[PDB]
RNA sequence: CCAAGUCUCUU
RNA sequence: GAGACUUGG
């Protein structure tokens, strides 16, 4: 657009290199799903390879999102699986499954809106939250290494 | 020479000017300002006796704050032969039946009460403007924006124009906020909101006569050497407070009603947790500003408050949270007293050492304040000292009061001269430090001031306005001055001869406070000259401008009964009605509001709602309106909310939930509506359900 | 096991 | 006796019933609420010094063991209670069950050390 | 009683109790119309499952299988719950249920129990419809878990009440918290009243009303009710619990004396001076108000006398 | 409204202060609500909405 | 999002 | 106890 004047060129350049545009152009490229952006604390927030959540509660958690919202870690703490469960059963016992789901319902007796119970536990389901600036910065970092 | 103080010459001129025309009186506050109200009431005293049914009339005194209304009613009763009525929410005036209102106006010729009570009373058609001969508004400068004074004023633009009463405004200051520039426009909007033109004294003889009861206190600025270095205990306390905040973030108390911003844009920390955060933040600010001894007083204030809250706790979780807050407060107090005792090694005479620590363990502002007091009232008669202190925050009053108590019972020269006292506005804090369930003390602080029991008063913007007090020898504005009107009224409070006025300002802000004080000087002189020199034969605003001053808001709605639903009152009426649906001590739930987002706004409002704000009200499940009523596209969130409430209340009235007067249907009237239709056989026995 | 058919109910249905 | 009996022995009884189940204990400690924080300052001396030795000691295996040994030295049986919290790490609450009512909480990784540093700040 | 429903309903047309109507002759009073906006019959079961997971668990615990699940959600929707914008609260449904259940249970005891006097019969009607017994029944079947409510206080009362009930093994009893003489030993014998929340009974009753509106078969509804309340039916047919205070005053050897309620803060208690086996035991009741404190004292006394006589 | 076939008036004057006088007279003599538009109120910058 | 003051209604 | 208003940050 060599014809354009300087001011419009500056404005458009600002928009192109602005954080929002970079965020979107990197999101559609599907890189952010592979970012290292959380401090490694294996004991608390991490999922060992051969170890996973119960499949029954897992499928409930992924399938039913509204149920997911209010799930609190104590509910997970309440799921003190017996050795048979965690070793060979995969899904938890129906009684444990129940008691846990009623516990999750009782969580509604706490804050639906203000308290995001999932944040402290999102790593269990594999969801992560990242500031936009970080996403943009990763895009520039990739460009810079390529250069 | 008469027990009923004769009208003074300027009072005579003001009365005979007002009796012919409605206008606003502008004079420095005093007994004369109230007396002119009394006399204008007297001069319109022809049609009180005869009943309203016979075309009788009454008088309407407009006060702002309930205590001001009380004091004004007392003064009227003691200065007049009429009998007056007082009307606030305390008197259970809401339930007063029409018979009570009738026989009341029969007994009380003059009706006195707060703004909103009378506003609702007129809007409920209990009485009509034609039924009122005159209306007197005091502190009328408060009448701006959506203030109930302004709503009551707008009401006149709805009823018939030939039975409109006399409107009189009393005030010692005309501007409200910091908009001191371009005075003429503001004065015109005030005079046009009301239906008159300002009046005052101009003649030099009138000037001299005014000066006898009004005095201009001598004022001197005082500044302290601002120091910034902070002690280790401060950072420690910050650290434990931060740790408590992070812990409390996840306390996970039981579900409470959703709390969201005043603009309905963002969620909020619940009132239970928010209150704790506010209290500790205030304590931190107090410690930062005034130092360590002030912090020691403030932490006991917190202890008392939180123990009271714990005793008012109902939840095991909230009980635990409040006990924990108490425990942290106690830790902080222990650490502070340790620091106090960590320096007592300097000397063991705790009496003078209290003074010395308050010099060392408190900020230069405090030190300057205390030694200024010491040099101000060294060895004077306690009866001869009557001075005020102005501070900003509520808890600052309590803190400084305790600090002054310790100082008085620490210094030999002031131990038997000063009697510190304090008082703050609504949400009265505990005036006691020992958390005992009940105390013998009953006399109110203001009554102590009037009777002379208390001579030193620490008030925060309460005693400034309206509250009648004897002329004070001194007035110390400890906190920085912020508002023109506040400055002027504080200055006027120091009314006595030779009264001294004092400002405490930080050195770095010295020149800015100078700028502000002289902008205020210029505004005051401008007002004076503009009143003196201006002349107008009409002495009232015209109809076109009066009509143009108000239409900006949404037009009001009225029914055939004439009941008016002001859009500004729509939210109040909504919450009023919704307070009656629940039938449980714990099932009580208020309406939940919601703001539509761009895409939802699109697929509902088409392309008609672009560049405007829209709010949707979704009333709870119980009542019948669940169509998700939508506000018309308004400019801002405030007007959008007002429109939402207006539309919702209109719909409810259309659904009959409002008893043709825009109040919720009480069970008695609600059942009477069905009586005739399901109880026909009753009427034949001289008996009705 | 088997509920007694409530006489009011068995009557209003038969 | 009228005021000694009628109002009075009932003043104690009513407050007593509050502390039993209703209230979180009450300030029946004699000193001024202003000086209530000094409760542990005036705590029973020789045992105070013994607890000082215990706290300053470095032979204790764990902060849990340190807290328990110190606190029994104080001759107080606390109750460790889990407060329901959003934190992944469980949140624990403790009671000092003494006239000077005191309650603390933190994450289990922190609770014990927080007891330690509290009593360091208080018992001094 | 003589003429049955579909006939004696017209008695009201005769007596104008409910005004005669050609559109709705009184004979047709079983045609309830839950009109208005409070109900919607169009929401897919997916939304309710999002609000009601583990449906099958609830179905089998209740003992009846539902067909249109929306009735459930509207019944379990406690008014404080904001995020259910498809249906109203349960109040209008518990309003009809309460009557429905009173009628059904009364009809059963009438048909089956002809050997028990009418006075205690009305007392038993009052006790069975009493929210206390209904709440005990509800908790016994663990229905409280699914109730969709959004207020702390009711949840907390529910929690403590279910705890106490479980400590009592789901047995109706004088709802007293024996704070001191397992109770420990102390100077005197005092206790407080376990408070029964009413929302629990309300939700159970609204659930039964939902059953009625869904099935429209009243025999099946009675099957459900009998299955739910059979233990209490068998029990109360052997003992009739009248009002506790009236139970004491009629009981020969109670002679309780209630002192003036002394006020401190919001708390008030009553000193209950009574006697048991010729020795005077001083028991005290507590409550928010005077009547509640007196009832607490009386319930504690009946508790003590039950242990003494058994 | 215009979109509904409505129409408006146009009191065009020569000088800004004369326009002021005429608008003020119109306001006092008519029940219509009139809008005053000169370059000082920033008439240029008003948007379509 | 925070401070001050005021008012209404209600325990 | 609940809401609101004004002013200011």
Numbering used by the authors:
A (entry chain D): 1232 to 1378
B (entry chain G): 2 to 690
C (entry chain G): 1169 to 1182
D (entry chain I): 188 to 311
E (entry chain G): 1379 to 1559, 1594 to 1722
F (entry chain D): 52 to 100
Copy out sentences from the published article reporting this entry, exactly as the authors wrote them.
In Drosophila melanogaster, Dicer-2 (DmDcr-2)-mediated RNAi pathway plays important roles in defending against viral infections and protecting genome integrity. During the maturation of siRNAs, two cofactors can regulate DmDcr-2’s functions: Loqs-PD that is required for dsRNA processing, and R2D2 that is essential for the subsequent loading of siRNAs into effector Ago2 to form RISC complexes. Here we present several cryo-EM structures of DmDcr-2/R2D2/Loqs-PD complex bound to dsRNAs with various lengths by the Helicase domain. These structures revealed that R2D2 and Loqs-PD can bind to different regions of DmDcr-2 without interfering with each other.
In addition, from the 19-bp complex dataset, we obtained a trimer state structure with three DmDcr-2 molecules at a resolution of 3.70 Å. The structural comparison revealed that the arrangement of the DmDcr-2 molecules in the trimeric state is very similar to that of the dimeric state, but the RNA densities are discontinuous. This discontinuity resulted in variations in the bonding details between adjacent monomers. While dsRNA played a supportive role in the dimeric state, the DmDcr-2 monomers in the trimeric state exhibited much closer proximity to each other. This difference is further supported by the relative distances and angles between adjacent DmDcr-2 monomers, which were highly consistent in the trimeric state. In the 1st monomer of the quaternary complex of DmDcr-2/R2D2/Loqs-PD/19-bp siRNA, the presence of R2D2 does not affect the interaction of DmDcr-2 with Loqs-PD, as they bind to different sites. However, it is evident that only the 1st DmDcr-2 binds with Loqs-PD, while the same position in 2nd and 3rd DmDcr-2 is occupied by the “bridge helix” of R2D2. Therefore, although R2D2 and Loqs-PD do not overlap in binding position on a single DmDcr-2, R2D2 can occupy the binding position of Loqs-PD in the neighboring DmDcr-2 when the quaternary complexes form an oligomer. In the structure of the 19-bp complex, we also observe some density of the fourth DmDcr-2. Structural analysis indicates that the oligomeric mode of DmDcr-2 primarily depends on the dsRNA-induced conformational changes of the Helicase domain, independent of the length of dsRNA (19 bp or longer is sufficient). The trimeric structure of the complex allows for the full loading of siRNA duplexes into the Helicase domains, providing temporary protection against degradation until Ago2 is in close proximity.
